[model samples]
Target: TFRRLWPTIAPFKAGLIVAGVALILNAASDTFMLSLLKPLLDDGFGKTDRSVLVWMPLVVIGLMILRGITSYVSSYCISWVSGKVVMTMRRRLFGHMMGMPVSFFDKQSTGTLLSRITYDSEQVASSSSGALITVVREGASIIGLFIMMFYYSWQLSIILIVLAPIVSIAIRVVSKRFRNISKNMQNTMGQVTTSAEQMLKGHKEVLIFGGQEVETKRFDKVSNRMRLQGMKMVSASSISDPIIQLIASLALAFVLYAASFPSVMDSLTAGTITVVFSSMIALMRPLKSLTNVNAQFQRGMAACQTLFTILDSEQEKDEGKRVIERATGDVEFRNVTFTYPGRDVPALRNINLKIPAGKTVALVGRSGSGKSTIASLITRFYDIDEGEILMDGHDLREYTLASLRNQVALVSQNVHLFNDTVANNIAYARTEQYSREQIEEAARMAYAMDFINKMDNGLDTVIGENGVLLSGGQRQRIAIARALLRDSPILILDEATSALDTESERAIQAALDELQKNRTSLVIAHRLSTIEKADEIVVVEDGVIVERGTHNDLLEHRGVYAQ
Candidate 1:
């Protein structure tokens, strides 16, 4: 886990170095204070040593001041580095998500991805910072205290050292348990986030359908699972501490018993006994803390694994060496076959069709009959399994993705609008400044200006999330306006006017006729009335084009198109 996380933290090397120095000083101060017990007890009580009494208090105070400053610096620097790491990780994750192929999103849930960024990143950061600090600071203190213990009385130190292997065996067992529980706990947390998000997004539906009880029960189930995992971790950590403490106590008993022996008593003083006993007791706290830190360290490792898996996944491929300033918009699908990921059935099969430049082609079929799949192929949202798609006599893969997509504008059945002013939404496709006049003209052509003008702020009105405040027709019109502003060489409309009323549909159809006059347009629609004027009409059935001709010609044939 540290190996994976090191690069993100490496940029803050200066801060980490300072923190390491501060931690060492802090640990040394703790040892120095304990060592003071010896001089004060032995000299001040037995002899008239005014020097030990007078200077001891001042030195103790000075050590405390040093400890305080080092502690603060160590804490501040660790926190600063941790925060930076979290930010860097999130930025990298989000940027990678943007570059992933569309199929990647199809296989992932929004809530799971969201949990990784918001919750899992935090776990990794705290583990890296907090666990590291505990290990370093406590480790130094343990080493220093051990040196003092052995120096004061190697005999008593040997007694403590005999129990080292036993203590380690206990910690090793608990650490393994902690690792297993921590991984389970992080997965449960992702489920908890997913459950809550699903409920929140569907709150209105739950209320209308009287599904409150069902949703409550569903949430409770995941919540209980999370609680159980958490308790298992707590139980393991809690039990391990007392068991280790008991073992330490046993070692302490032997030390005291041995000290009572005449031979041992001849060599040891009260001050020596006090220092050894206190140091043995003090060792328990850091030891227990280090054991407990195993849980957090494991959780962080699990989180890092989750994050790195996504970071290492393949990005969208753009291997084309050709770039085009503008395409003539002639598209052809030659014996194309494609199946969606994780599906056995092909969405399109043996499809051969051509949409000539400056002409309109209409694809009509039942739901799941591959009408929309035809439109998506033209844009290369997914690659074909066999054969090829071409534009202007060149393979679609020959042109750069950006250059190819730049030639087309699409408005699908599901219209997505950002929470922005009407004017901005209409001109979303433009990279450079689009004049207010251009935005207004697009809205007028799409017949969106009628409702937009009624809004209190007109073109400046905020649309709310996904234009939630607008009626269905109004939202669709805004999407159409956006497509119109693009003025690309090719256009794809997948049930673009499905939400509009008949009167509004007729008006928009006339506007669309004018827009399609000089572009290669592919229209996918359920309503036959929308495509009667197309230059050609194709009927798809079970992933194959079963019929094709001019509209009147198909109607005269009395085939599937006539029906």
Candidate 2:
């Protein structure tokens, strides 16, 4: 985990070094203050020196100011590093997700992905900074205290060394438990997020179906699982602390016992004994903190593993070097076959089809008959397992994905909109390319302007998320408007008019007829009336093209298309 995280932190090297120096200085100041106990007790109290009386208080104040400056610098630098690491990880993760294959999203939930970005990234970053500060600052303090203890009385300092093996054994035992619990907690956190997200997104459906009780019970199960895992982590970390402290106390007891001997006492002065005892006691706090930091560090490593798994997953392949300015929209599938990831059944099998430039082809089939899969294949959402897909006489994979997708425009039943002005939604992909007049012209073409003009701000009104504030027809119109703006050479309409009323469908159909004039259009529709005028109609059944002909010819044959 540290190996992977180092690059993100490498950019903030100067800050970390400064923070390290400041922390060491702070620890040294603490040790320096403890050292003064010797002179204050031995010389000032016994000899009553006038200089000690006059200068000691002022020296203490100066040390405090030095400590204050170092503390502020270390705190500020660590915070800066922490924020930067989180930002970098989030940006990297988001960008990587954008390039992942569609299959990756199919196997993962939105809530789990969201939790990784918001929760897991925070865990890793906070642990990195928190553990770094604790280990450096407290570790340095322990080192300084040990040096001071040895300087005063080597015999007592030697006894404290026995505390190491015992405390280490305790920490090693607890560290493994902490790591396992942390992993479970992180996984359970994802489940909790997913459960809440599903409930929130489907709240209306749950209410209408009288499923509130079921949903509540379902959510409670995951929530309780998360709570149990959290308690396990707390219990594991809490138990380790007292065990370590107990071991340290035993070492202290042994040191005091040895110090009472005549041989040991004969060599030690009162002030020396006092300072040694004080340093040993002082060592306890940092030692305890350093041991507890192991739990936090383990949690951080677990989170890193979670995030890196996604970061390292395979991205969509774009190995094609060929680029095109504009395609003729001639698309063909030659004996193509494809199965979705992790599925045994092929979504498309031995599919052969051709769409000529400037023509319309309609695909009619049952819901699972692979009509939409043909459209997905054209856009290269999934690669074919056998044979090839060709565009404009060249293999589709031979053209760069960006250049190939640029030639196609898709409008599906599921319309997606952003929370932005209507004008921006219409020009989402080409926000800077289209002017207000062009945007309005596209909206007018799709007949969206009828309602858009009725909006309070006309073209500049902000639509709610996914255009939730708009009616179903209004959202579909915006999607049609977006497709009209693209004006790509190839167009796919998969139940694009499903959300519209009959009257609205008629209006958009006329607009779509005009838009289809000089483009190759693939229409996937369940409603037979929508595709009666297509140049050819293909019937799909059970992942195979069962029949193909002009609509009237199919009607005469009395086949599946007729049915």
Candidate 3:
């Protein structure tokens, strides 16, 4: 279950292998240098092997330099591999996320989703990757140090072996408590982050509602919990450290006192006793660090569990093999029915409509009249429950998903502009098809060209988030220009100009007139005048097209269309 998490970089098998090998060589060098410490201190630094005694310090420094080189390789490999893994994971997550159906996002808070992407990614990056490297290097170093210590003095090694069970008990008791506290700490951290994210996003609303004091109190509550949990784990380690140190010190005293006696010293010379004492001291620091790494590894495993939740999400249904570059404007809805996921009732029923080339059709209704559902079906954002939609003569399912949607452009009421230049926003929908001249011309037609030149940064002006820097009408105009530049055979105007005043609407209407030419337009209008000039009007109510005729014909008949 632990290994099943972190599948984000599981595809990069080759890089992971190379990183593992480098870590091995690095850990070996660390142990090898410590092994030499025993001889260098007692033998070389002792009285006089002649003039070479002076050079021993220099020789040891050179050995340490070689160790540094191997350590460098290991660190480099780890850093590179972790960075690539993060990049690969980010790309895969976005690709998988965008393909998800609308209902998936609807179920979760925006703050929660942002937390997964940011806080979770940061945990994986800073702690998980670094801790993984520490685990490999330190674990190998512990093993190597033990092997060398045994060869130097088996009596001392036997002493440690007998006490190993005691040390194991101490570690287990402390770790169990530390792990529990650490898990609670992480949960507290999540609460803190989620709260902060919401506060930042809704800062304006929060300020207006005078929620500052309430938010601060809630934040402090989680902050205190995190602090307490952190202290609990640290205190557990603190309690355990002194007990382990006392046991180790007693064992060392037994060895040292024995060496001082003539009986034990007869068998072992001064050099061997000195070397054993020095080696124990050298092993102490790295072993302490290794114990800390144990806690880090546990936290990383927890984060991986969260990532698996995202990777395991069910994706939207996609089916189609052949792709058409251009679809002729012939759309048919054949007994189509749609029930959004989690909704008990279907959104549309028996949605049968056919729109031929260059025909402008208006779909009008109340909020839930399935006007927008038909638009969603046209683009195949969600598949119909019981029917196939055809474009020209081919079923929409037969065309590749990209091509199916690429044939249409939508100038929605809320135009989503990026934090980029005005030019980029308008031409975002048709990046490949539009040249600079065409983009400018399209912007001019949409009444946005004047605003572009007036900006101090011109086309390079960075827009605020959701284009909050621009007025509502300006945002819509930018989207309209994008639709004009898209030049797709099919256009969907989803009550786009409803936000504008009378003069603004008239100016936008001129742009709409130019954009609507030679296209199969499916317009969803809130205001009546927007649909007045349509070739045919389909009035939808309660998931059915209750009336369908020309504007005059429906007005003359006084059907629901007139109402």
Q: What C-alpha lDDT do the candidate models reach, one value each? A: 0.77, 0.78, 0.70
Best by lDDT: 2
* TM-score, model 2 to reference: 0.78
| Candidate rank order under lDDT | 2, 1, 3
Tens-digit lDDT string for candidate 3 (151-193)? 8777666665555445555555665665676677677767767
Please provide TM-scores, in order, for all candidate models, with all chains considered together. 0.77, 0.78, 0.71
Residue 15, model 3, lDDT: 64
lDDT tens digits, residues 249-359, model 1? 777777778777656464877777788878877887777677677667877877878888888787767888787655674788787779867788887777778887788
What are the C-alpha RMSDs, in order, of all predicted structures? 7.1, 6.8, 6.9
Q: C-alpha displacement of 362 in model 1, angstroms?
A: 2.1
What's the distance in Å from true for residue 380, model 3?
A: 1.6
- For candidate 3, give the lDDT of residue 208: 88
Clash pairs, model 2 backbone? none
TM-score of 3: 0.71
Candidate number that wins on TM-score, 2 or 3 = 2
Compared with the true structure, what per-residue lDDT tens digits does model 2 show for residues 1-563? 45578898899788889999999999999998888877777777767776776788988898999899999989998878877888899999999997887777678888888998899999887886788888999999988998998788777677666665565566566666766777777787777788778778987898898757878788788778878767876786687567756766777777777777666365877767788878877876786678778767888878888889889888778888897666775888887778876889887787779887788888877647767777888787877777888778888777888778877788765777777788888888688999999999998888878788887788988876744377666566777788788647788877644544656555776777767777888888766676677887887778887778887777776466544
Model 3 regions lying over 4 Å from their true place: 1-73, 108-128, 147-154, 161-166, 177-262, 265-278, 281-318, 321-332, 353-360, 363-371, 390-394, 418-434, 456-471, 531-563
